[PDB]
Write a protein that binds this DNA or RNA. Structure first.
Lengths: 145, 150
DNA sequence: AGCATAAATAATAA
DNA sequence: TTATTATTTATGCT
């Protein structure tokens, strides 16, 4: 169901700009309550429609829902938008790779509670540790073996 | 008269956005150009409301006499909207350069060394490096404005 | 199954 | 005004 979608992508960018919003902001609000599928790059790609049809179809409903909720918060006070968004999580910093004792301590705590992580669990762990994903997944791989 | 120009502020930006237009196009096209010129910075400041209300009120008019003038007389055959702007505009985005790792170290080597170089020594680096100056100017620009995070 | 960054644009300085 | 710096997008990556 195609040109349906393209129109949504269209309206979305519009409505977004109308609530005076950056992809980055949405990115943050979204990834919080939804998931990593909702990063700023993702928003850009969606809006530009640089995704596969299977992917758009999936995203659309979840964008629409959220876009509405946001528009509601905007209604009561253009500072309730802010409540709903973030409104300024900001420290986009590079993912560490070199280990620190605090890091290895953390990794081990995770291990006692989860020796055989699924790959999703590995991305989740790495994100919150702010470590390279490969660094984390290999640590776990060896630790078992 | 404040909201009269504070709301034309807010709305002007979004009308310009919702026409896929850069500030730097607005001023660039709407520039007289035999006086008064209109720079991007103007447009920016205007939008963000960084001007004296006294000069705000001055600009506000000539804005509408272009914004409205181009919203209709541009949108009705967009091959013509893009001629409301003119200046042989429509060009395709620059392709995202991918640097050879050989050259990748070359940079941050000379970067760990000299953080904010000069246009003279920059084009020197670029020359011997087989990469075009602007691209190279920006690697530093970027790497400089990125390491604040980490 | 999104990070890292290169380019573009917008803000701010001169 | 111009020149620069900072934010924001877009895109290479299997």
């Amino acid at each position: 169901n195609m040109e349906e979608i393209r129109e949504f992508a269209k309206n979305f960018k519009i409505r977004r700009l109308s609530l005076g919003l950056t992809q980055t902001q949405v990115g943050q609000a979204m990834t919080a309550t939804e998931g990593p599928a909702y990063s700023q790059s993702a928003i850009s790609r969606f809006e530009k429609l640089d995704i596969t049809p299977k992917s758009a179809q999936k995203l659309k409903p979840v964008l629409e829902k959220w876009l509405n909720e946001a528009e509601l918060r905007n209604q009561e006070g253009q500072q309730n938008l802010m409540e709903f968004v973030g409104g300024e999580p900001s420290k986009k910093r590079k993912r560490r790779t070199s280990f620190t004792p605090q890091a290895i301590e953390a990794l081990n705590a995770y291990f006692e509670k989860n020796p055989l992580p699924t790959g999703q669990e590995i991305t989740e762990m790495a994100k919150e540790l702010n470590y390279d994903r490969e660094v984390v997944r290999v640590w776990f791989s060896n630790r078992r073996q």
